[PDB]
């Protein structure tokens, strides 16, 4: 137990680790989508607006 | 030794995904200010030309 208390903390504590940041990596890809689409349908919008 | 690394580690997800929140929330912040940007001037675009 005093070498599982190394072998296998630091493991746990690893594959939180990567998960908590590819969490955070799965979030800014959905960023990237939220703020593309913020200009893809302005502009559409604007195109309409300014021939109404 | 094990259960303070499972503590220590599981806790970091835990608090990973409240910043996936995060991002998910100020992206659609900043979008609404894309659109509601775009939307006042396109009205001054299609004023400038009626006026004209």
């Given at each position: 137990?005093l070498?599982?208390?190394?072998?296998?903390?630091?493991?746990?504590?690893?594959?939180?680790?990567?998960?908590?940041?590819?969490?955070?990596?799965?979030?800014?890809?959905?960023?990237?989508?939220?703020?593309?689409?913020?200009?893809?349908?302005?502009?559409?919008?604007?195109?309409?607006?300014?021939?109404?």
């Amino acid at each position: 137990d005093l070498d599982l208390a190394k072998a296998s903390a630091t493991d746990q504590l690893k594959k939180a680790k990567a998960e908590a940041q590819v969490i955070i990596e799965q979030a800014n890809k959905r960023r990237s989508q939220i703020l593309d689409e913020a200009k893809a349908e302005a502009e559409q919008e604007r195109t309409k607006i300014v021939a109404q």
